[PDB]
Amino acid sequence: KELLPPIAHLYELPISKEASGLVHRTRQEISDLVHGRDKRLLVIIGPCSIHDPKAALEYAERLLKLRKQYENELLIVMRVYFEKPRTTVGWKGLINDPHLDGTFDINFGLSQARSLLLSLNNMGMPASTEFLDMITPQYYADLISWGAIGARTTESQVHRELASGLSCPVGFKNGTDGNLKIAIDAIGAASHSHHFLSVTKAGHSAIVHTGGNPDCHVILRGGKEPNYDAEHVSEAAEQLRAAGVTDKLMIDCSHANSRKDYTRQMEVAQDIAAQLEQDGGNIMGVMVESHLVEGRQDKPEVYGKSITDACIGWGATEELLALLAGANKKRMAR
Amino acid sequence: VKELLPPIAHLYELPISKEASGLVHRTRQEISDLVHGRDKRLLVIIGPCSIHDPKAALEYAERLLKLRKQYENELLIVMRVYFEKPRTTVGWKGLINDPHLDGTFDINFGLSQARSLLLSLNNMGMPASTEFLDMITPQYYADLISWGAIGARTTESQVHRELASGLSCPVGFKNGTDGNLKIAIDAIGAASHSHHFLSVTKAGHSAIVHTGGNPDCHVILRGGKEPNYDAEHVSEAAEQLRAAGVTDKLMIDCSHANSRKDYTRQMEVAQDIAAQLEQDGGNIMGVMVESHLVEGRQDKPEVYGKSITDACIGWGATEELLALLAGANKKRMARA
Amino acid sequence: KELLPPIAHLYELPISKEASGLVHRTRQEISDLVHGRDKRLLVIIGPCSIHDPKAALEYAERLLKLRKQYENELLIVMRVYFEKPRTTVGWKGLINDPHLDGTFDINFGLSQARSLLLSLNNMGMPASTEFLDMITPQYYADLISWGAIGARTTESQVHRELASGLSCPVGFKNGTDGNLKIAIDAIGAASHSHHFLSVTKAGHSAIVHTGGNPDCHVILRGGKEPNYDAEHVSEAAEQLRAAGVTDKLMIDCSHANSRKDYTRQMEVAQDIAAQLEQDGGNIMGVMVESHLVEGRQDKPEVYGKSITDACIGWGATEELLALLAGANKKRMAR
Amino acid sequence: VKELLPPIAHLYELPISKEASGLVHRTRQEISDLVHGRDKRLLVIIGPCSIHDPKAALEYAERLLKLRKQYENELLIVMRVYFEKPRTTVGWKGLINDPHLDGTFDINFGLSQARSLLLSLNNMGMPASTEFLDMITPQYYADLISWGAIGARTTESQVHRELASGLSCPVGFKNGTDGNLKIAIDAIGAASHSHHFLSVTKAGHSAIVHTGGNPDCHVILRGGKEPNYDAEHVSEAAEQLRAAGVTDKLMIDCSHANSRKDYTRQMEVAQDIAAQLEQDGGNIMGVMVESHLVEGRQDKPEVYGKSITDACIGWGATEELLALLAGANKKRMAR
Ligand SMILES: [Mn+2]
Ligand SMILES: [Mn+2]
Ligand SMILES: [Mn+2]
Ligand SMILES: [Mn+2]
């Protein structure tokens, strides 16, 4: 029944020295990308949502080899998303409903999330997630190397407040109809200090005073129309410069950029590869929804197959990563 | 720097009176009736963009109470008592977050002052409305609120739909800042359902909460890239509302993007609404107006009764605007 | 550094159906002794203090064989004391300092105590302890079948309040100089309802309203002089009746009744044996300090040997239990 | 059924003033000076057995303040402001536990009232003392306390010795209800050391605390089966204290078992103490007296300024008793 406070989980599942070092390092490297110091491509890649730790670990084992192999061209970090914003109602992810049956066993959800994150980081795979809920971060944020604020929450002051106090770099998605300005505004908000109410590690509400997050950037995830091409990127960088914030940005191959057709993710990646070969100087990253098995399913019957947005399968993932590595290797050669 | 006192500290210093409790209960029911088309009085959510001075707020409430009473057969008047302001980037977030208006963020003081003003307003017979922006502050005052808003910038946010699903007052969801109505329709859907999520108890500890859903949600047309207040936008919205199986009674904001952020054009929007109410106006249950003692705005809190956030109409024009709506709705209610 | 609330421990170490039922039946069975509805003799027996779980489990397994053997004559419940009152300063028990080295790892101490109690009840051995601290009981009282309030705290209003809200029977010891009245007064006070501050399972202070504890009794543990003989028992019983409370009592064979000399416990047990054969109608229980190996030691060097008060070893334990079982079989047959 | 407000609720409504903090700091230091033989003024813990009416307590404090000033070179006068009462069995546990005196246990109001009264006392220039009975309540007002007692019924209790080890005021431990002095000497030992134990924070959450030990503890002679205030008893206690390596400055209660539970005998005891101070009295650092505006006791709070717990001397006898002790100690100090 009762909610265990973060300290209960931190006590049982303390961050290892390995996990700690991988997080600190990956955050700094990503920061270097955000601010143009390094020209590797951040690739945020993996399932739309985590519903099975076993499949997640297997996926991570395969992805780790590509992370190492392409480490001079790409900085691979896995999607380990525990919180899903629904259009109306639906399963909100492993934390809110881990047994996938409407039992809402949130204590078990948080434990499993933390434990998965700990295991990923211990094997050498850094993790990313969307920070949707205001209280759950205390349970796992120490294990996160990069955070997203979703299209649906980028304009929300309470999420900009949250981002302002997070220790990892944060990407803000443009709004669901394509509005980029709200994400530029969000970087501005989140880079400043805020005072607001939040929950401590002991589970009590408190006034927090944050320092601001210097490592925020935008993510182009499509709108009414896709926004991944060179023209959309150029216009975005112009707007970012006029706002006085970093003009290095991330492109989501999924969602409104593939128009909900997982087979178009490769096409968006190819367009990005062509940008990187021609110039692509404003691109610091890409996002990809990828799993062991392609497509999606309503019920969790098939192993390693998404129960939220459809993903590319492992084979296409190998091709997509090869494609970006080769292209960015050329960008970095200039 | 002081730790956060829990809701119980304030609830105990400032308990709700039987009178305030009765006003809130009754006003929420009356509003539910408007939202579901059972009564044809027009809800008018009117008053300052933000509260920054309780004294001016109380004087405003005294003048407004006279009109609330005068027009009570035509209009259901509820004061805007907004304590939480969503900024485009950065800026003063309202009385709770920064009550001394100087960047000292004395939230404990902000919370008691908000609760105390709300209790005084209800005790004088003036019900209160606010935008629920923050996730943890509502436990401190929600017992004193008769109608709530979820702002344009948060209607699409799952955590705000969650919050709404657990509120005991009717809730209006604004269309998005670029005009997207579908998100507010989706929000009614979400907020009408039960949710499980994390929240904070009255003792100040985090907990898992399980809400029952809010059956009294509606949309608010507040403009986008173009205004959306006219008969054609109302008609299109009503269609979409019916297609989604939710109430097709809606509220129209005369301010913000519908006035094009020009306080002098609220009356223009109100005239258009008045005309709709006289011709038909059957899908309109409410209106929103940004009004203060004195018109305009000011960067610093120098002038008494003048907004430090969005520019408002002043008292004289408020009288005219309200008389306009009362007269027009009298006609609508008289029609066979 | 931060104290985990009881709920953290109750979540990791939930009580089993078996342990739950054992605790429930044992409390019931013991209430029947307290109020004179059954004439079996409660025997609270085991180490002065628990300092090693392994030895506690070995002891328990031997004690279980005798609990079964003597179940028609004796109700055997193990001493599992985790909190020790010191005359001045010293080791306060396994909870306060579980590593025995002055590190005070109280979180570990509490989980270790809870886990031991869970294993004991799961093997069929009910447990008893002294409730000394106001905050720790919430972490394990669900696993306790009988509780003591010590000689040094029986007169304390806060301990009487505590006893008033526990769900197990509770014995109050006469005071360290031999005062019986403070224990009689304690039963009165603890049987009534109290309002006082206590800490919830979530770790927050609260006002609790107890219903009172109707299963309290006195324990004769000696004073300036021993108080175990039939003369002292008779005088205690008259005073008990005069206060309107149960005149069934428990006798400690240890502490000041043995003059702090562990061999003398058997002398006291023999004397009680004589009483149960003659009559002994006011006796409902005895307490005995017993370990695998006899004596004491300042350092935990020898396995199964006390580091607090000296205990009788297993050999003598067998003889003491045989003696009481045989004597009480005769009492019960009358 | 209200929930318990945490100490920060009351601290932010009733913050300690500069003047009150100053008086508390000074008084604790001054008493420490007595405990450790740097000053020879006599600490006098004097006032009602229990506080049950703030109006009467404030009137009493105003009278006592005049005397605190008059005798300040001889006596260090501190008011008894006892909020927590240990009962033999059942009964009214005090103003905190039951402030409306009717079994409604309105503990939030009780704590507020206690804190408010203590704040006003310190603000008028009168330092306050109390018995610390409960493990959770001290956080609400300990900052306003200049001297604390651990009662005879808890001096042997480990949880109370732990509490004492973390308090920032001097603490007196009473001998046992039957006359045992060893338990109080043992308690000073225990309380002088660092402890790790569970306690509650200002925010209302349980926590492990690590105390630094209380170097300012001393014993209180309060009688047992027989009274223990005379020179022979003082001398025997002093020897035992020196044998245990702890301060041999002690306090003598004129009330309770040393007066054989009879309020008219408190003067008898103070007379005896007065002669000890004139002859020698080098081990006596203080005394306790149960005093109110009007003498006696009463079961119902009918008469203003009259005890409803133990019987007290009235204001007239209080003036005489304090004159006595001041006169006698003036001579001790001059030797
Ligand atoms: Mn997705
Ligand atoms: Mn506004
Ligand atoms: Mn022992
Ligand atoms: Mn008294």
Residue numbers in the entry:
A (entry chain B), C (entry chain D): 16 to 349
B (entry chain A): 15 to 350
D (entry chain C): 15 to 349
What does the paper say about this structure?
3-Deoxy-d-arabino-heptulosonate 7-phosphate synthase (DAH7PS) catalyses the first committed step of the shikimate pathway, which involves the aldol-like condensation of d-erythrose 4-phosphate (E4P) and phosphoenolpyruvate (PEP) to form 3-deoxy-d-arabino-heptulosonate 7-phosphate (DAH7P). Entry into the pathway is controlled by the allosteric regulation of DAH7PS by the pathway end products Phe, Tyr and Trp, or other intermediates of the pathway. The DAH7PS isolated from N. meningitidis (NmeDAH7PS), the causative agent of pyogenic meningitis and meningococcal septicaemia, belongs to the type Iα group. This protein adopts a homotetrameric assembly, and contains similar structural features to the other characterised type Iα DAH7PSs from Saccharomyces cerevisiae and Escherichia coli.
Of note is the single salt bridge between Arg126 and Glu27 from opposing tight dimers, which may play a role in determining the twist between tight dimers. The crystal structure of the NmeDAH7PSR126S variant was determined by X-ray diffraction. This structure was refined to a resolution of 2.0 Å and crystallised in an orthorhombic space group (P212121). Like the wild-type enzyme, the NmeDAH7PSR126S tetramer has two distinct interfaces between the chains. Superposition of the NmeDAH7PSR126S homotetramer on the NmeDAH7PSWT protein yields an RMSD of 0.61 Å (1328 Cα atoms), whereas superposition of NmeDAH7PSR126S dimeric units on those of the wild-type protein gives RMSD values between 0.18–0.25 Å. These values are consistent with the small decrease in rotation of ~2°of the dimeric units with respect to each other at the tetramer interface, and this change may also account for the difference in space group between the NmeDAH7PSR126S and NmeDAH7PSWT structures. The structural asymmetry observed in the crystal structure of NmeDAH7PSR126S may contribute to the in-solution dimerisation of this variant. Similarly, CRYSOL was used to directly compare the collected data to the hypothetical scattering from the NmeDAH7PSR126S tetramer and dimer generated from the crystal structure. These data clearly show the NmeDAH7PSR126S variant adopts a dimeric structure in solution comparable to that of the NmeDAH7PSR126S tight-dimer. The dimeric NmeDAH7PS retained its catalytic and allosteric properties.
